[PDB]
Ligand binder design. Structure first.
Ligand SMILES: */C=C/C1=C(C)C(=O)N/C1=C\C1=NC(=C\c2[nH]c(/C=C3\NC(=O)C(C=C)=C3C)c(C)c2CCC(=O)O)/C(CCC(=O)O)=C1C
Ligand SMILES: */C=C/C1=C(C)C(=O)N/C1=C\C1=NC(=C\c2[nH]c(/C=C3\NC(=O)C(C=C)=C3C)c(C)c2CCC(=O)O)/C(CCC(=O)O)=C1C
Lengths: 588, 602
């Protein structure tokens, strides 16, 4: 239903009056039916008439707008065309666009902003959100006389929850009450980011329409997006009626230029909150929004700084010991779980796992790792940022439906199906209990949903992929040396030849003890020397052919002995190009 | 100096009146000398008298406070002791604490004032960047309130303030750009500015009327004015404002993420009183300036962090993609590697090798820095540093590398470890600063203009955590190196004719299993390479094998020594195969046998 315009209804809340003027001539092109009564001229002659003639404004004047449409705040207005029509003092404001303008007027009515000030310095300097959230609810319920004031905090999915609420001693609270995202469509949520503070004076009013529905010259309906005399959606009107309420004032809590929440208000008797008190509620909205976003900042900072202290202790201790013992890992578990605030963690290293804290069993961890690195969930890896994470496992991996009491959520590094070394942090099932609006009262329990993964705790995880490469390097570093030592404790005398790209000749890469001794010259002086160190012309030709063509050769040939003829077994080593790049040489 | 007490001066600015009441009855325990004149009754009988006697407060009343001390805003007050005491409208406010209270009163004055302020507060809430709004305040506030000079004093890291915005008269000279010492506003004062947001000196060099009972007659404690706006400021500051000429101040506090980001300092060279409605309009503009900038600081921060990660991850991917580090691979990495840290130069190292991109010192100079960093005397530096090592001025940290400053005056060196082989060095070249000072109980005026050489653009913490977030590219570089060398050698040992296999030693609950096995070894058993990897060494030999012979084999496995024994193999078909097991203990850093090489020939 979010498909409704609302910004272009063609109807005005009766309480005030609207007049759309052409900026060329200054003549009223469009006017609401409530205008003809206020001003001294019926709809017929009121239309096409120059605005100056019909209404007078002393404080400020409308003007020519280039591109940025400015607005003129609520100022004194008088009706010279009528002989005594001052049912109340009339105050008018302007919406000055480049194509056309819009003037809106409403009564003045009724120790105001100076009386608000204590409450704004009250919140300003104070801790946590709830404390400020209630300081509003309570402080606002006292300043503007409302029967129910509440703070409607939005979440990730756009489902609102009433965190703070100040009602009458009688009545029942909607505190704790969760509501659908659908109760406030995206369409509307936009308007309460433009047109900050909204007011429905009387629910079930008579909507007085803008008589020339479309612009007589432009052929376009009037955009009330910025107009505060806006006729709200009938979908919501019947909804407020079915909730009882006859009046509503909804302030927007815009934190770091985004809709964090609303200060929704309920008056069960009809009530008009004049432009003055309407701007007082905006002061308390922005003031709350203020140190909410500054409190969000303090928390953020404090956490970032202690998360790095942990992170770097891990980095150091990890790079320190060259031998990942079972004891090493248990000195790392209190801290590895903390840098991400997980309840469990499982360190993998090829068919091996090291479980710490509250993590599923050895076999279950393998079932998750198998299912993650899966071909159908290869799109998941593609889309994820630096690592993969779930808030509810039951959705992402339907096969792993269960496993939720231990791993309902997790973070997984590497994003790549690199295998060998991997890491998995896990937050177990955290059963929620959503007190609905009624999808009167209902109480759905959410199973399988773990504590939502913090982005602070998510970039700190990506800021650890260096411990996966640290793990992986240290593995190859040990295996290479194991094999180097191996080939060095051989009797067959072997050496590795790196192919020269015709820019250089075929030099030596690796050489074992048994090879360096048969020449006489030790290991250090043979590394980096050409294989071309008398011999038969036909025989060396066979040797160089395999070096040329990049093939194999076995030829008995004389050495440089202090003649030592030794058989040369040359084996081309596999290459990613297939093109021979290295050659193993054994001699027995 | 920062050790001066203030907050309990025992003196009041003459312009107003103070009265400390005991909350048990309502009796004035302490009173300022300026009270006896305005209240009527002299100091003698005014003391110990129920406040109810001079009470003429209609608007609101004081009350019993539990723990959180609330305040009552400026409301109408009168004096019933005298038939026409002043000819000026008097207004009083309250500071209600749980132990005692405090009532302060001052004139109402003239020049609706808040409704007229609203446009300007709307205009900043919309304004971009910190600066554009900082001037909207300075200019908008200078017009609203008649101050001869309004300025926005932004604190820098050290607590040295800089006047970023300033709205003065057409005459007089600007302090715009003027940097000041942190010492000019001690930490003890900076605290009070965070409690009392709006502050004013009506006349510099006033007669300070003291609170006659200096200490509480019951408590025995001096009055903590703090929250009291009639507070007598420090004489250290009074002589300072006098030496700057000024006769009146009005200093608002810009408190951003409940921390002192700045002040809206004001100067009136003629004496000036700022009323109750006035004082609070400047607070509204200070709650907005603090607000809009704290949220603008957030937007910027977020936008930068998110585009810093886009770069970071492009590097990560492209780096892990190609398995051989070509010079062109490094040529497309340079625009982005320099960006993720916003350095002017970068030098990628890989064992006596360097790849310089942008504005980095010469190949030889980079080696002189790398040598000096990994130095034994500067091993303490690596110990203390966070994830990586960084300098803002090289000339201090490495005095030997005094020069090199026009290219590498600052840098981020990583790995922190003297791991060598692979390393990375980002560098910001010399950025000659020009700090326009106030002067160096001062005589101020003179803008001294110190020039700072060898100091590069200060290293951003956003650019510092995005630097630690690249440490994985040194380990990526390093793994890929060993990954290639190991595999080169694995392929080597695999294309062997002797028939060799590596045995990983077992323990108390683990037997001796096989780590690596070649094709010449896997064929003599028959069973291919893949089945034998992980196979226990005790499987390999037959179950008919000589008791004395296997004992010799297991002895070398036990004691961790060498053995050479001809023994029968586990023959799949049933063909007797007896090869001479050459078992060589492989060198270990402990010396304790960890692995074994098993050659076979007999
Ligand atoms: C089409 C879907 C809708 C459902 C379902 C529903 O309940 N409302 C729907 C649409 C509209 N809601 C609009 C505005 C709106 N809705 C709320 C919701 C609540 N307010 C409350 O006080 C409580 C509980 C105490 C709830 C659940 C509010 C506060 C508002 C803004 C109110 C205002 O205008 O003052 C809306 C927009 C209409 C418009 O403004 O033109 C639509 C279409
Ligand atoms: C003991 C150290 C001090 C030196 C030296 C000095 O010059 N002042 C010292 C002490 C105090 N300063 C206090 C307040 C204060 N200082 C400043 C700084 C400036 N004011 C300016 O106009 C300029 C440049 C034009 C600068 C750099 C300000 C703005 C303030 C606050 C003014 C006020 O609102 O009163 C101070 C605290 C006194 C108090 O309020 O009790 C001390 C001790």
């Amino acid at each position: 239903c979010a498909r409704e315009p609302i910004h272009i209804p063609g109807l005005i809340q009766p309480y005030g009056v609207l007049l759309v003027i052409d900026p060329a001539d200054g003549r009223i092109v469009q006017a609401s039916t409530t205008a003809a009564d206020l001003l001294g001229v019926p709809m017929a002659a009121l239309l096409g008439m120059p605005y100056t003639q019909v209404l007078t404004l002393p404080e400020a004047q409308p003007f020519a707008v280039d591109d940025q449409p400015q607005h003129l705040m609520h100022a004194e207005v008088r009706f010279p065309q009528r002989a005594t029509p001052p049912a109340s003092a009339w105050v008018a404001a302007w919406h000055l666009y480049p194509q056309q303008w819009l003037v809106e007027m409403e009564p003045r009515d009724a120790v105001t902003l100076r009386e608000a000030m204590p409450l704004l310095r009250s919140v300003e300097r104070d801790p946590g959100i709830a404390e400020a959230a209630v300081r509003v609810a309570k402080g606002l319920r006292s300043l503007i006389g409302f029967d129910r004031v509440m703070i409607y905090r939005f979440d990730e999915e756009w489902n609102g929850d009433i965190i703070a609420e100040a009602r009458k001693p009688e009545l029942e609270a909607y505190l704790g009450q969760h509501y659908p995202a659908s109760d406030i469509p995206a369409q509307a949520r936009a308007l309460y980011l433009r047109n900050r503070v909204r007011q429905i004076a009387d629910v079930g009013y008579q909507p007085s329409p803008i008589q020339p529905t479309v612009h007589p010259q432009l052929g376009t309906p009037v955009d009330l997006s910025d107009v505060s005399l806006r006729s709200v959606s009938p979908v919501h009107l019947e909804y407020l009626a079915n909730m009882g309420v006859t009046a509503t004032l909804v302030a927007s809590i815009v934190v770091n230029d985004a809709l964090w929440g609303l200060i929704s208000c309920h008056h069960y008797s009809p009530h008009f909150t004049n432009h003055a008190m309407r701007d007082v509620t905006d002061a308390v909205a922005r003031t709350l929004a203020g140190r909410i976003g500054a409190l969000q900042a303090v928390a953020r900072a404090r956490l970032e700084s202690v998360l790095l202290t942990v992170r770097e202790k891990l980095i150091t201790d990890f790079n320190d010991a060259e031998h990942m013992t079972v004891e090493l890992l248990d000195d790392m578990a209190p801290d590895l779980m903390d840098v991400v605030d997980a309840d469990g963690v499982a360190i993998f290293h090829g068919n091996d796992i090291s479980r710490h804290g509250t993590t599923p069993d050895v076999a279950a961890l393998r079932r998750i790792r198998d299912h993650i690195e899966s071909e159908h969930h290869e799109a998941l890896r593609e889309d994820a940022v630096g690592a993969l994470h779930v808030d509810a496992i039951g959705e992402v991996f339907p096969e792993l439906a269960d496993l939720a009491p231990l791993a309902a959520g997790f973070i997984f590094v590497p994003l790549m199906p690199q295998s060998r070394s991997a890491l998995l942090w896990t937050r177990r099932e955290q059963i929620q209990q959503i007190k609905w609006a009624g999808n009167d009262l209902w109480q759905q329990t959410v199973r399988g949903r773990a504590r939502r993964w913090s982005p602070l705790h998510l970039e700190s995880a990506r800021s650890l992929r260096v411990l996966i490469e640290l793990m992986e390097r240290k593995r190859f570093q040990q295996d290479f040396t194991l094999l180097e030592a191996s080939l060095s404790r051989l009797r067959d005398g072997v050496a590795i030849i790196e192919r020269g790209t015709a820019n250089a000749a075929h030099r030596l890469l690796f050489v074992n003890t048994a090879f360096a001794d048969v020449c006489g010259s030790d290991v250090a002086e043979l590394i980096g020397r050409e294989l071309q160190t008398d011999a038969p012309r036909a025989n060396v030709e066979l040797l160089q052919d395999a070096l040329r063509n990049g093939r194999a050769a076995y030829v008995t040939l004389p050495l440089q002995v202090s003649p030592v003829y030794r058989q040369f077994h040359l084996e081309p080593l596999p290459s990613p190009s297939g093109v021979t790049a290295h050659w193993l040489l054994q001699l027995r």
